[PDB]
Structure formats: structure tokens, C-alpha cells
Ligand binder design. Structure first.
Ligand SMILES: OC[C@@H](O)[C@H](O)[C@@H](O)CO
Ligand SMILES: OC[C@@H](O)[C@H](O)[C@@H](O)CO
Ligand SMILES: OC[C@@H](O)[C@H](O)[C@@H](O)CO
Ligand SMILES: OC[C@@H](O)[C@H](O)[C@@H](O)CO
Ligand SMILES: [Mg+2]
Ligand SMILES: [Mg+2]
Ligand SMILES: [Mg+2]
Ligand SMILES: [Mg+2]
Ligand SMILES: [Mg+2]
Ligand SMILES: [Mg+2]
Ligand SMILES: [Mg+2]
Ligand SMILES: [Mg+2]
Lengths: 392, 392, 392, 392
């Protein structure tokens, strides 16, 4: 399998560029040049690159430096044909954001965090980015009495409403994607799951401009089913972007290559995104990898890991397609009544009164008899794993 | 401290009545008589009792039987002065519900599930209940290919819209509270956290009628901060009811007495619920205990465990109040800038244009200097714990 | 592929026989006749069957009844050629065991538990069983002050020493396997992981007769690496038996078909067991499936699920074999230096004196240059998964 | 209360000296001077200080500098009266240890790692340290095929045997304490729990010289009961040292102040360590705090957090003693039969022959009557908690 620009694989500059300085050790790799990253990614098949303001322009560069950097990066994109589908802002690294950006208890920090993002929005718009991802990594707490959650959601909302106002007024046409994470680096982060993030967005001034950027590992850190979470996000039409990676349950954020953590869930996920209604994907945006090349690797291992993400995604896609195309799967699906869930429970024009008058729905219903029929779900599941395994 | 009707402690018939038949062993206690339950609960200070249809009327009782039981029950309520603030429906025990009630793959089960709930709505209406709790315990799956989540949400929505229509046409005035649970009995349950449930409710036809019934242990099964999810629910104004109990992280659902699991979080929760806005509670509904007397206990143990729930709450309430009235705490709160979060980030009439014109919010902002000042959060936490321990 | 007696696949009578009564619902299936279970298992390729005393002979059956059941069971065995490689005792279902068997706080229960086991040893010995599995499911506590752990371990040891004595004196030649589990049904179970069980066994009077019976999902309930724990069990030479199944991290005990939980760990487990040192398997006992057919299934789903366990094991075995016979994998292993771990750190006859004298081990060691070399682990992991996916 | 030297509270230099650089952000505090650290800790009540070689002497320090630093340090200890009860070696920070120290796939690194420890043993013996703590933070893997566990355990053993040989021959009199941790920084670390570590130690050449150093947070990262594991550690007589801190279940290692995570388990732990048999503590070593002052704090917050550790331990101690001394508790303990567990199951001189002859242990045992009696565990738990809340 080979990647095409239509696959829409994107990578964050901070992914292949991670120097591997973890919580217990020093960096094991040297810094990666943005221009070189552009060339190497173009080379392995990516269609786009993303970055945090501070990944491209060192925090505190003068305008002369900032400008030179932007010019060079812009050239590289030019020469390679890579686009910038999304940009994000770093509101977590600098010590000033130790209690958050938008929700820091310190008012001055909140004013500053907003300005930092407005600026990144400008650059984003200039490079043609369409999505602004917001990962509130420091919004949250270690102790319950330290953060008024209500006040915090008010301030989170105040800040986002201004951002949409600005984008709309400047005609940027950005979409905003809130990225949920349950913990790390704060003891607990606000808007911990895809669900909490969706509920929150529904309360903004222009909710139509807002959605989520869920990440595989983030939902897995809570032992949640990532595919089912995405399915819900799709039902709401709030899946604006997606970060793919691997994780092994509730533990520190691993950021493994996509499919190197929960493989079975990685499979059902590609199936969901690609085998959409009427053949077409159910999702049209970037297939963004927010992962980290393991600390035990060098630059060779880095490029290898970048390609492993693409490989994993295309090998799974290939098996999801075959799963669905298999007449034996098709028969097991019918036996399990998976599609019967699509038929309304109620008949056309039927309401409570017609339902209450239907004796077959209650008075004459044989619950014991229906309760004994099997659904044949183990067999259908075994058919899926055999396709995954390349055994069918 | 002693319980008053104003404390609003309620218990489910199924809590003290749990015979302790678990996944690996037989029941260790004989059945509890409902009238007896009512009399005993009245005695320990409960102001209300709740029940699933099947807890009071054995599945399949003829109408004469059913009628007989309801009349005895109402009499016990009458004699003791206990009310029924909420009722619910058992859509999980009978084999017919093995794949769900409202979202079973089987259309006939779905129709039957609605009829079972309508019937319970009529009895709740009859007893004066104000809330209908819906715990979709069998809605979900063990395998990703077995359940079309999108269609499941459509059918979940279809069923709820009908229930609201009916209540509203008959003038029942019920409020509906969806109870989220991440797993057990299904590998994964639909609407797994408080967040997922709130996002869902915002998509119904009469949203104002729907909220959630979050459970301490259910959010903890995913390692989430219960107090923090309750704060968000309150922020959305969707906290319609609450189920209190104890749990020790992600493992099977323990249903311990409130405060016997994560005690620190039990403390911050009571503080949040009672030390509300004015001086008044932030929440006005029933403090419902959805717990189980451990399998090792006989009926003396059951009544002790019921009392323990009430004692934990009142003991926590007393320390929450003392914490807040402490001048040393007020001082720590001022140093940590907790209240500063409540002041808008922007000055009245300030927009993005005024923020961009403020050089002090960015160009002349000394991030380094601000990033060096500590928040004094540990100290504040330490004062909170010392209040919990009666050390101050 | 097809299973052979040489594969040594065994099933507990309680797996295919699970009536599917869970913590929240009634059984969805009727009881399975033991004789019929023997015939069906023989037919799908099992080499053996195992059972708890109470699975075969209903608790409290008079001697004539028991004798009768046993005789019919033996006939079925004879007729099919299946063996009974292991037997176990139910010390968890009856209310009497609510606080444990060997470690109940009540002395009379501890005496009765031992007698129940002696009786099962006799029957095991008569059926030719070589292993007695001990799963102390009720040994533990819900509350810290309710159980004296030190006293519990003494009582535990006291019971086990007696059983070994009896066995040795009767010439039964049994081997004893303790089965660890972290929780469920007790809040916390004694000897929670394979490590704790092994350390305990080392303190018995005759440690050589004792090992462990680790279960896939039990270690995963604690989010531990099952394969790595089996590796340590093998290092200690204490892997006496193994229970294979599937689990999705920390949550209730799911007991899915082997491979339907963490697929990547199932793969590396089959690799460890079969591609042992010297071509041959590293482990030769039974490959026992301790799982449960999902509650949504009927008897067809039950046999399908029984065959899925064997299929899963044989498919992974085939891929594990191909993995190792791949010259590219071999090249990647040499680059990752996996085998170099097997070479002693010290040279032959070298001690601390010689080591202290080797300047190349410290004084002239270039930590920094060594630290920059990559291990190629990601690429090796990618090749493993490509084999698993049948992509190579 | 007030800490005394008899309380034996110790802290590592790396605790209060943690600069607060986490996986997602820069240091928020300046470096702490070791002499100042000695002085500050002496002031708050610590009786000892501990450190990693690299905490004191910067990696790659010339002999002159190293010596310079030690001499200043010894003077500070002299002056303050603080001792060094334990020393440890950093085998996790430098890039050369990316794949481990003692079990690195690379043989040259294994040799270097032993040299680095030998050198710390010398400094430790010189400062009067009693225990050598060994935390194998990089021993493990991210991918199963990358590490031969059996070979890794051989090399781990090989290195330890040598260190013991050396210490014995130089007459240093050290005890070695292996510190288990389930994950972080490696995906999976070797010897993941207290159990696995004890089992391992039992396989060394001079096992009497090896024990464990369990850490509260480490066992909780796997959702295990810390108190119960320490109780097993004490039963085996392998509790050579203990690391105290707080954690909120399975997530990144938080390193909170002791008792700031699972408060109920912190209570039961203090009870176990202090209300030992013969009135006296069951444990007599250092009460060492391996925690981290939150990133949101300045140097004032740092000293506050250091003192919080001592206060938590002494407030808990005080309540555990009150608890045991309460007559109502004594009554509850009796009804729960906690002490009956200490009486042998068998009468003195009884063996299996006499047990088999006792009809009252089986044939005439009424399991049903015994199964109906409750143990009063909830009431007992409720009393423990009221004691912790200062409510009695
Ligand atoms: O957990 C880290 C987060 O995933 C970030 O990579 C965001 O996506 C970008 O700030
Ligand atoms: O996990 C069990 C659930 O909490 C139920 O008790 C509901 O609250 C009512 O069906
Ligand atoms: O968790 C259930 C246990 O694994 C049992 O199946 C034992 O293996 C035997 O009693
Ligand atoms: O999680 C890290 C470890 O706990 C260390 O602090 C050790 O105890 C000393 O290497
Ligand atoms: Mg991440
Ligand atoms: Mg991300
Ligand atoms: Mg509930
Ligand atoms: Mg519950
Ligand atoms: Mg099991
Ligand atoms: Mg088992
Ligand atoms: Mg430690
Ligand atoms: Mg730690």
C-alpha cells in the first residue's frame, strides 16, 4: 500500500520533532529543522503539516527572526506541495501557564493567553489553515478547592466567544476544535472526555463554528471505547479533526504509533471512518497522527515510525473493506440484526396512543420466548478478527 | 448530627433490599418486605423511597396482585409520611433485555421496552413522583461490529421524545434524568459519562425536560473527578438528581456507602452541593443513596449501612461548613486567587479590538516574572484535609 | 487449521456451562448436561475437561446421587477419550464462604473449607488429575480493618501445608497451582497478582509442589503485561497451569474468548509459549480456556465461542512461527540486540576487582556516544504486527 | 503535633529539590542548593536526607569538584545532626540508560551501570548509609519482542549478586531494597509490583541481604491495595524501606504529599505500621517521603508541602491510636471475629487424619446456618472513618 494526497495523512511538527526528553530523562535526539521535517514528510507521503506557534518560532523571537522563519517554512511548503490544514497554540509549556491559559486563576495570564492565540490565528489564516485546535492541557487542578469549575467554564467560554468573533470579523473562516484529555499534566483537566467537550461547545455563542479534536490515547486513558466515542461525535456532527495514536489503557500518555496500542479498537475505528454511508468515508478531514517516536530511537527510527503510522492505517483500511465485502460477514450481520436497529421503533405516524393500543407490544408479548434467541455476536466478532488477521 | 426531612435523604428499595447474590455467589440475605422497608427507612430519617417497577411488583404479577401491592405500599407511605421523589424501570434483568431495552437490535424488544416505561410513568404520576430516572444498563455492546452506535442514538432519542410527549399531554410534569455508566453489565455502555449524557440530551425535542442522574461510583469507574463532573453538570443546569455511593477506582461497581471509597472527593462534593452561591445549597434535589450493603452483612448490617450513608453526609457537611468559615482558609483562598477566576477576563465593553490595543496583555507582558509566583495550592489543600480530619 | 490432542486445549465445565446470570440479570441459557458437555468438547478438539466439585455434583447431593453422577461422567470420558488434567473446588458460591474459605475470620468455616478440598482431591486423584487449582476468590476484604493479612497468610499457609501432606502421604502426586486475582468478588483479594502468589508459594513447607495458575484477564484487571508476567513465572519455573481468556483493561472480569481482549499481548503470549528455547515450547501443560460465552448468545453461540478460542490460539501460533522464520525479523532482532541480553555482563571469571579495573567500563566509557545510538525497537514492533496482520 | 528524631522522617534531595519540569513544560523553580536543603529539612523535623549520586554531584564532575561537593555536604550534616539512612543511584536520566541500566540490550551499558552503582556504594558506606535503594526505572520495554524477560531477570540477578559480594567483602554492611513500579517511564517496567519484587529477591545468592522499597503511588498506579501489600511485605520480612506519597489511581505518577491521594488507605497504612504487635510499631525503618511539591508552587509552597507530609503522618497516627483504644471499636472487632483469624484452623497436634475424623467439620456441618450470620464489617468500617474524621 502507498499513501496518496487523498488519504490526508498529516503530522504535527512536534511529533517527528520530539527530542525525547520525558519526565525522567534528558533528550536522546537532536532538534529537527522545520524545513527538513517538511521535506521528509512530503517524502513519506503526508499531505500536510501542523504545528504549535512555539514549535516553529521559538518563544520570544523578535519579529525579524519570526519573519525569517516563516518565510523559509513557507518556501518549503511551496516546493513540496504540503499544506497546513490546522495550527494550534502552545498554552502549556511556559511557566506562566502553570495554572492554565484561558482558566488560570490569575487574570493577567488569561488576557495574555488570548493574545497568544489571536496571533497564532493570524499566522494560521495566512498559511491557509482551516482548523484551530485548542488543547487546554493546563486547564484544571491537582486539588479540588483550588479551582472553581463553574467560573472556569465561564472564562473558557468568554475566551472562545472572542476568538470566533475575531475570526468571523476578519473573514478567516476557521473552525475551532476543542481537544479533550482527562489528565496529564494537571491532576484532572477540565472537559475530560469527547462527551464533556461536546456538551460545553453547545453552550457557546456560535456553536456551529465549534467541534472537537478527540485523540485515541486520551479517551483510552479513561478506559473508554474510542470508536464508540467517535461514533457519538459523528452523530452530533462535531468531529472537526482527529488525532490518531496508540495507548495501553489508563497510565501516562504513551503516544505510540496508531494501532500499536489497542489494535482491535484501531480496526473498528478505521472501519467507522472509511466504510461510511453509501461507500464514502463517514469522515472527510485530516487523518492526523499526534504520536511520538519512542525515546529508544534515533532519526532512522523516527522516519520509520512516521511511515509505520501510514502503514497501520492503510493495512487496517484494507481489512475493514474486505470484512464488509465478505458475504459471510453480510450473513452474520443479518443474523445479529445489526441493521434492524436502523428501522424506527415506531411505525409511521404512530404515537403513544397507538402504541398503548398494540397488545403485541406488551399484553401479548412473549418476553421469555424472545429472551431465549441468541444474537450470534461472538461469531460475527470472530469473523472480524479473522479478516484483521488476514486469515479470510 | 441527626437527619431532618429538609436534608432530603432518599434510598432505593433495591439498596437495603439487595439480597447479595453477586456474579460469583448465592444470596446471603432473605427478601425485604417493601412495607417493612418503608417503616425502617422512615425510622432512620429518610424523607423518601424510590423503586424500579420490578422491585415492588414482581415481574409478571396479574393486575389483582399488582393492585394489592400498590395499595399496601401507598398505605405505608401514608402512615410514615414518606414520599416517592423518583421512580425508574427495570430494563436490565429480564433475558429479553440482554441486548438493551430502547436500543436492542431486535425491534420488538424496543417496542416492549417503551410500553414497560409508560406503565411505570403512570404509577410514578399516581404516587406523586417528580423524576423518571432512566439507567440504560444493557444499551451498548461487547464487540464493536455488533452495535451501530449512530442508529442506537437515533432509537434512544426516538424513545425519549415519545416519553416526553406522553408526560406532557397527560400533564404529569415529570423531569427525565439519564443515568450514565461506562461499563458493566455490557463491555461498553452507550452514554458512558456525565458529559456524553449531557451532550445527548441537548439533541432531544424537549431538552428543557431532560437532565442527568450521575452516580459517584460510575464516574470513578473511569477514574474521572466526580466533584468536577458535578460542577460542570450544575454549570449546564442539568443536575436533575444524584446517586451517591462509594467506589475504589476502575474495577467492578462496588456500591459502597457514600464516603467509604474516595473520601477526599466525597468531601469536595458535599462542599460543592451545600456551600452554594448565596450561602444556600447549589443543589435542591434529593440526596439519593444508590448503594449496596456488603454481602458479608445480615439485616443488622443492612440498617447500619443505611444509617452510615446519612452519617457520612452530615459529618462531611459539618466539616465543609467549618472549612469555609475559617479565616485561615479565607486567607489561603485569597493567596491562590480562587475568586479572581470569577472576574471576567475582559473589562466591560472590551472586545478583541481593545484587547489587541493593550500592549500590557502581550508586547510588554513579563511572562517570566508572573510564571515565578506560586499559587499556594498545597497549603490550601492541607487546610482542607485538616478540617476533614477534625484537626482544626 | 485443526486442533490435535497434542495441542492440549482444555475447557472448564463452568465455561461452556455458564448460564449467563450476571450481577444485573437472570440466566439467558438453560443448564448444560455434563455428559453432553464432554461429547461436544471432544467434538471440537478439546483434549480435556476440568470442573469444580460443585459444577459436576450439585452442592449437597447425597452419596448415591454423587456416585451416580460420577459414574456417568467417567463413562462419557471413556467413550470420548477426553482426560481430566486438573480439578478445582468451589470455595466461593455458598453463603458460608462470604468472608473466604481458608481465610474466613470464622474458624469453623476454615475447617469446613479444608474438608471440602480434601474430598475433591480424592475425586481428582481417582479421575487422574495431576493439578489441583486453588482460586481463593473470597479470601480478602472490602474494608482494611476487617482482615488481618498476616493472620490470613498464616492460615492460608496452614491449609496448604496440610493438603500437600495428605497428597504426598496418599501418593496422589498432585501439583498445586494458586490462581491470583486482584479483586472481584471481594473489594481486594489476597495474593492479587502472579508476583504475590509466587512469593507466597516460596514460603510453604514444600514449595516444590506449588506453582501458579495465572489468568489472562486477571493480570489485565490490574493493567499489567500478561506476557511479561508469564515470562517471570517461567523464569521461576512456577507456571504449573494457565487460564487463557480476553479482557479490556481494568473493569469487571469479562472472560472473553482468548484473543478478543488485548490482541497484541495474546500474540506475544503465544510466541513466548510456543517458540520456547530449543525450537520447542517453553511450556508443556494444558492450554486451558477459562472464559464465558457472552450473555447475548444461545447454545449455537456457545459452541461457536468454544471453537473461537482454539481458532484464535492456532492462528496466532501460525503467525508467531512465521514471525521468527523471517530473515528480516532476524535482521531487526540483531539490530535491536535482543540476544545480546543473554550474554553475561561479566566476562568469564571476571569479578568486581577486574570490573573495577576496566577503564572501558567507566573511566574511558563514552556514555554520550552510546546514548545516541537507536535500538530500532519501533521497526521490530512494526514487523511483528505486519506478521500478525498477515501482511508479511 | 511535632516531629521528633524518633519518628524517623526522611526526604530525598530530589523531592524538595524538584524544579518542576514535567513531560509538558519547563521548570518553574530554580535549583535548590544541597546545603540549604540540609538546613531547611533539619528545621522542619526530618532526621535524615537521601539522594541519588547525580542529585548531589552533577553528572560528569571532575574528582576535585566531586570531592569539593561531598566535603561541604558532610559539613552541613555535621552541623545539623541529620543522617543519610539510604542512598540510591541514578540509572534513568542520561540517554545511555534509555533501554535500562542493568538490563540494557547493550552489554557495554550494563557494565557501565554496575560501575556507577559500585561508586555510589562507596560514597554511601562513607556517609554511613544502611540501605542501597535500587529503582530500575528504565528496566522494561514499550514492545514485547524487544526484551527477553528471562535474560533480563538473569542479568538483573547477575548484577545484584556482584553488588552483594562487594559490599560483604568491603565490610559495608548494606541491605539492598528493590523498588517496584508498574510503568513510567517505560511502557512496562520489570518487577512491576511489590509481589514480583519479593519473588525475585528470593532467587538471589544472598537473599537475606535483599528486601523491597515499595512506594504508595506505585502500587496504586495498578489499583492495588497499598496497606495489604505492605502487610504481605511484613509477613515475608522484606520491608527494608518504604516510600510514602499520594496518588489518584491509575494515571501518571503524581507524587502528591502522603495522604493527599487515597486518604482511607493512608489511614490503614499508618495503623499497620504503628499499631504493631506488642503495642509497638510493626516497622522500625525510615518513614521516607518520595513526593514532589506541585508545579504551581514556589519555594514557600515547597517548604509547606514538606511539612504537610509530616503533619499528615502524625495526624493519622494520632487517630489510628484513638481508634484501637476505643471500646466500641474493641466490641466491633470482636463481633467481626478479626482476632479469631489468629487462632490456628487446626487444634494443636491435629493433622489431616484427625480433621477427616471430625464429622463436625463436614458431615454434620450446617453451612446454611453459618452462612446466615453477618460479620459486622460495615459498622467496623464506619467507626474507623469517624475516628479518622475526629467525630469520636
Ligand atoms: O496530550 C498532548 C496533546 O495531544 C497535544 O499534542 C495537542 O493535540 C496539541 O496541543
Ligand atoms: O448500576 C446500577 C444503577 O445505578 C441502577 O441502580 C440505577 O440507578 C437505577 O436503575
Ligand atoms: O475469576 C474466576 C476464576 O478464574 C475461576 O474460574 C477459577 O479459575 C477456578 O475456580
Ligand atoms: O518513580 C521514581 C522513583 O520512585 C525514584 O524516586 C526512586 O525511589 C529513587 O530512584
Ligand atoms: Mg497525547
Ligand atoms: Mg493531540
Ligand atoms: Mg444509580
Ligand atoms: Mg452502581
Ligand atoms: Mg476470571
Ligand atoms: Mg481462572
Ligand atoms: Mg520511590
Ligand atoms: Mg514515583
Amino acid at each position: 500500500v502507498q499513501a496518496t494526497r487523498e488519504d490526508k495523512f498529516s503530522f504535527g511538527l512536534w511529533t517527528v520533532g520530539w527530542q525525547a526528553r520525558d519526565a525522567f530523562g534528558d533528550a536522546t535526539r537532536t532538534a529537527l529543522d522545520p524545513v527538513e521535517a517538511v521535506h521528509k514528510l512530503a517524502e513519506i507521503g503526508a499531505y500536510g503539516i501542523t504545528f504549535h506557534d512555539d514549535d516553529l518560532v521559538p518563544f520570544g523571537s523578535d519579529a525579524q527572526t519570526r519573519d525569517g522563519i516563516i518565510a523559509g517554512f513557507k518556501k518549503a511548503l511551496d516546493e513540496t506541495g504540503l499544506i497546513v490544514p490546522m495550527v494550534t497554540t502552545n498554552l502549556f509549556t511556559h511557566p506562566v501557564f502553570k495554572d492554565g491559559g484561558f482558566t488560570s486563576n490569575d487574570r493577567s495570564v488569561r488576557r495574555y493567553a488570548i493574545r497568544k492565540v489571536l496571533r497564532q490565528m493570524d499566522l494560521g489564516a495566512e498559511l491557509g489553515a482551516k482548523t484551530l485546535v485548542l488543547w487546554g492541557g493546563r486547564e484544571g487542578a491537582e486539588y479540588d478547592s483550588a479551582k472553581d469549575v463553574s467560573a472556569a467554564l465561564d472564562r473558557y467560554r468568554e475566551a472562545l466567544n472572542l476568538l470566533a468573533q475575531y475570526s468571523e470579523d476578519r473573514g478567516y473562516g476557521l473552525r475551532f476544535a476543542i481537544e479533550p484529555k482527562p489528565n496529564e499534566p494537571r491532576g484532572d483537566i477540565l472537559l475530560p472526555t469527547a462527551g464533556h467537550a461536546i456538551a460545553f461547545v453547545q453552550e457557546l455563542e456560535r456553536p456551529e463554528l465549534f467541534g472537537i479534536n478527540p485523540e485515541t490515547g486520551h479517551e483510552q486513558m479513561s478506559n473508554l471505547n474510542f470508536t464508540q466515542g467517535i461514533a457519538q461525535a459523528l452523530w452530533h456532527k462535531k468531529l472537526f479533526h482527529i488525532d490518531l495514536n496508540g495507548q495501553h489503557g489508563p497510565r501516562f500518555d504513551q503516544d505510540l504509533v496508531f494501532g500499536h496500542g489497542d489494535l482491535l479498537n484501531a480496526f473498528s475505528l478505521v472501519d467507522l471512518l472509511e466504510n461510511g454511508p453509501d461507500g464514502a468515508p463517514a469522515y472527510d478531514g485530516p487523518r492526523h497522527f499526534d504520536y511520538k517516536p519512542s525515546r529508544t530511537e534515533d532519526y532512522d527510527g523516527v522516519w520509520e515510525s512516521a511511515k509505520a503510522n501510514i502503514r497501520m492505517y492503510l493495512l487496517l483500511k484494507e481489512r475493514a473493506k474486505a470484512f464488509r465485502a465478505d458475504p459471510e460477514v453480510q450473513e452474520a450481520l443479518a443474523a445479529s440484526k445489526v441493521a434492524e436497529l436502523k428501522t424506527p421503533t415506531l411505525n409511521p405516524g404512530e404515537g403513544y396512543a397507538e402504541l398503548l393500543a398494540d397488545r403485541s407490544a406488551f399484553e401479548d408479548y412473549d418476553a421469555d420466548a424472545v429472551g431465549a434467541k441468541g444474537f450470534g455476536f461472538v461469531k460475527l466478532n470472530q469473523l472480524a478478527i479473522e479478516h484483521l488477521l488476514g486469515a479470510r
